[PDB]
Design a protein around this ligand. Structure first.
Ligand SMILES: [Mg+2]
Ligand SMILES: [Mg+2]
Ligand SMILES: [Mg+2]
Ligand SMILES: [Mg+2]
Ligand SMILES: [Mg+2]
Lengths: 217, 182, 25, 53, 144, 96
RNA sequence: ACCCACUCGGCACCUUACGAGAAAUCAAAGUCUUUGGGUUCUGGGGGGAGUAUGGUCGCAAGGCUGAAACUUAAAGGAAUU
RNA sequence: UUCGGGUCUUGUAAUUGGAAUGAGUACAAUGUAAAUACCUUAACGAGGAACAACUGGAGGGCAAGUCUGGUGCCAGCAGCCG
């Protein structure tokens, strides 16, 4: 079973968008889950941690399960889903879905000089969530992922080979750390390099081209 | 009080004990090339790490200029000689990459199993320990010998010892002696 | 325990100590 | 006795007569065989030391 | 700009400020004052021999309950009466009375360990045989 | 329904509660002769509750004499039975 | 004297945050991992203790300065149920 | 159509075989200032009981046990949490 709500979903089903790069170009909302699955079949999805989370009542307590889910490949798209449901497997599934919806690109770059294929980041760039500042820093070839476990896993999922990290603040709250890392990754595609002064065309969106095939009959 | 003899604690631990995946990987590596101790893998990594450090030092200083050009070149030469680095790759950035897997697959440990001789890495190790296998006519009993590419074409069985035609072999000899009396 | 009260008690103790010292002298 | 009862109360069971767990490279080899070659039966998440059931 | 003169001929003020600040860090203070030599029973040493004056079962701290089988030990070098805990399954059956006993720290950079109140040291080498060895019978006591 | 008493072994000795110091430490008088500073064992802080003076079993330590451990509590009936037996001199009284 | 439009200077306040911040909140607590305008001073887990001692300045009460020994895995904040 | 041959490859079992050894001892020889030890090497050296690997762990941190016996807030553990 598939069945699309939203124009974009319909478009994807018709098979007129080839890869998510185009989607990213026009910053399109991807509220429908299946789209990412369709476009990226290469999705390696990892569970991080499932801390029980409590809520107090007149009798007993509510034990929900907050599960941090990463999603990725080696291409430079990463997901991060956080979900809090009562059933643990169900929660994990939901988290996966969320991560798939989220999935974001990375400007993988060069350590120093071009040589062959980018497996680092462009710029020393950081996030901060709650009070956890993950900085990441373009490490040179082969110098590996230099990160705390969670962050390291995230980097692996991304398809970064080489990264220094300065994770600061209370990184022991894993969720927050992960969020910060994700934010930092998102930021990559924001720092205007001089490789970016060059003027673009501004394409008419898939929404404004394949307009007739979109929307319900 | 003549001088101090300069040691080097060379072969160096990782900064955490048990990250499961790391352990698993190292175990796998050991299995692949038959290494008595984690130390061997660690040794290799440390050596590679040294090289990487050197490369990093070179790189930051602008190439076209002296030390980077010269020292870097020398390093490159050395790496090609050990056989670890490939002739495709003479750019220093390539050096910066690499793996433990490149170095382990160039010891006299495996250069036996690649050239046949024993077949099975553990068997090869055993052979090397037991004074079979010379690199030249100079006999080797160092599993992590690192074969220098241009002298790889010379890993043959020893001029002494069985398997390479010298004597029955101290158990075979015994058996022969036993047979003799009958 | 109130901090002010604690301070007061400390002061009293100090005074007592001073008195003792004076006596000794 | 208060001073170390559970050591001087518990029955003595000897170490069994065992074949030698082959040391050096051999043990590493064995471990490799166990973990990445022969492979303990697949269920989802693997177990290094399973309790018999 | 916050505190510190981001100045340039500023440096003496910075250095002095750092010096003044440092004293609030405990370890540095201890190193400098020389708390190691004036106090904390051992002479800032790792191990010290002492003499088993009297065996005392110290009644443990809260949640936990038991008696903790320690020894009031008079150290030789300083002459200080400590209480050194003794590890494992009794082993006072090894310690006895009026014996020479080598003590260690506990792992807590001085201070108190786990749940034993007013206790700082493990015993290791009793009479010169080490408690572990005695207990596991890998080596045995020199008669009396 | 009624409970049954557990007799002493060796070292473990009957005694009387004299005064309440606090914390779980009670100065108990042993009928051997000497007064002792006794500790209320973990099982007894739970349910066992004393008064001004009751009859007890106390494990006397192998290395310390002046400090010991209250193992067991005796009721009025139990005390009377003990008296009848002849383990204790006739002076133990129970009144609240 | 009001009134309307300004305008400096102030005492504040109301919205938004596009920034902060742990949060409560804040036009500053902003322009801080994309960290660097100039400068003082103060803090380094909680107790012990603003104690003891020594200086000092007090007619005294006291103040300014101000320890350590010990001792404990929390003591704290700001929110939520 | 119910198999199967195990044709192609894998491990495991006190089983059972032939091959390697240096650690040992050690003729000489070197080595040495004499001599030890190494480096060469005659002869003698391996059949799980031998020519025998520990140390620490297996609630979590952190790899590894909701195994099998005893103890039962006791013993005792535990760098913290326990
Ligand atoms: Mg302080
Ligand atoms: Mg063991
Ligand atoms: Mg143990
Ligand atoms: Mg065990
Ligand atoms: Mg584990």
């Amino acid at each position: 079973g598939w069945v699309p709500v939203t124009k974009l979903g319909r478009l994807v089903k018709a098979g007129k968008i080839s890869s998510i790069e185009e989607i990213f170009l026009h910053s399109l909302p991807v509220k429908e889950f299946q789209i990412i699955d369709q476009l990226l079949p290469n999705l390696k999805d990892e569970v991080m941690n499932i801390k029980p989370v409590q809520k107090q009542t007149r009798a007993g307590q509510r034990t929900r399960f907050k599960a941090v889910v990463v999603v990725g490949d080696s291409n430079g798209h990463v997901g991060l889903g956080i979900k809090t449901a009562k059933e643990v497997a169900g929660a994990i599934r939901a988290g996966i879905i969320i991560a798939k919806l989220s999935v974001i690109p990375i400007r993988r770059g060069y350590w120093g000089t071009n040589l062959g294929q980018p497996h680092s980041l462009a710029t020393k760039t950081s996030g901060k969530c709650g009070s956890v500042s993950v900085r990441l820093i373009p490490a040179p070839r082969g110098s590996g992922i230099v990160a705390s476990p969670a962050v390291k896993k995230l980097m692996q999922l991304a398809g970064v080979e080489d990264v220094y990290t300065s994770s600061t603040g209370s990184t022991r709250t894993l969720e927050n750390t992960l969020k910060a890392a994700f934010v930092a990754i998102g930021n990559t595609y924001g720092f205007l390099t001089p490789n970016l002064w060059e003027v673009q065309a501004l394409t008419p969106s898939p929404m404004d081209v394949y307009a007739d095939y979109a929307t319900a009959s | 009080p003549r001088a101090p003899r300069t040691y080097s604690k060379t072969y160096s631990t990782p900064k955490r004990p048990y990250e499961s995946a790391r352990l698993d990987a190292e175990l796998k590596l050991a299995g692949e090339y038959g290494l008595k101790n984690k130390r061997e893998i660690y040794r290799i990594s440390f050596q590679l790490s040294k090289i990487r450090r050197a490369a990093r030092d070179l790189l930051t200083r602008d190439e076209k200029d002296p030390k980077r050009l010269f020292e870097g070149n020398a390093l490159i030469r050395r790496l090609v000689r050990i056989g670890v680095l490939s002739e495709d790759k003479k750019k220093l950035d390539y050096v910066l990459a690499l793996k433990v897997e490149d170095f382990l697959e160039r010891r006299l440990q495996t250069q036996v199993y690649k050239l046949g001789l024993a077949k099975s890495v553990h068997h090869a190790r055993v052979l090397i320990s037991q004074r079979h296998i010379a690199v030249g006519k100079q006999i080797v009993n160092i599993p992590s010998f690192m074969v220098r590419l241009e002298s790889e074409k010379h890993i043959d069985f020893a001029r002494t010892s069985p398997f390479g035609g010298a004597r029955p072999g101290r158990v075979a000899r015994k058996r022969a002696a036993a047979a003799g009396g009958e | 325990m109130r901090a002010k009260w604690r301070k007061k008690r400390t002061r009293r103790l100090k005074r007592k100590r001073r008195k003792v010292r004076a006596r000794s002298k | 006795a208060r001073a170390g009862k559970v050591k001087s109360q518990t029955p003595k069971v000897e170490k069994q007569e065992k074949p030698k767990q082959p040391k050096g490279r051999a043990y590493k080899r064995l471990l490799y065989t166990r973990r990445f070659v022969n492979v303990t039966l697949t269920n989802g998440k693997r177990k290094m030391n399973p309790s018999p059931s | 700009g916050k505190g510190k003169p981001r100045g340039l001929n500023s440096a003496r003020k910075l250095r002095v400020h750092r010096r003044n600040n440092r004293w609030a860090e405990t370890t540095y203070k201890k190193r400098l004052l020389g708390t190691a030599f004036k106090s904390s029973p051992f002479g800032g040493s790792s191990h010290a021999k002492g003499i088993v004056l009297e065996k005392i079962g110290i009644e443990s701290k809260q949640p936990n309950s038991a008696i903790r089988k320690c020894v009031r030990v008079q150290l030789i070098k300083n002459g200080k009466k400590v209480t050194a805990f003794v590890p494992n399954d009794g082993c006072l059956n090894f310690v006895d009375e009026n014996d020479e006993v080598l003590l260690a720290g506990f792992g807590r950079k001085g201070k108190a360990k786990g749940d034993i109140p007013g206790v700082r040291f493990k015993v290791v080498k009793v009479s010169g045989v080490s408690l572990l060895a005695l207990w596991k019978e890998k080596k045995e006591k020199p008669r009396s | 329904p009624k409970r049954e008493l557990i007799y002493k072994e060796e070292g473990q000795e009957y005694a009387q509660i004299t005064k309440m110091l606090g914390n779980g430490r009670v100065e108990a008088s042993c009928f051997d002769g000497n007064k002792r500073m006794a500790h209320i064992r973990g099982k007894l802080r739970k349910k066992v509750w004393m008064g001004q003076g009751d009859i007890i079993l106390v494990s006397l330590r192998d290395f310390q004499d002046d400090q010991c451990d209250v193992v067991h509590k005796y009721n009025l009936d139990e005390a009377r039975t003990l008296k009848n037996q002849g383990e204790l001199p006739e002076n133990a009284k129970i009144n609240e």
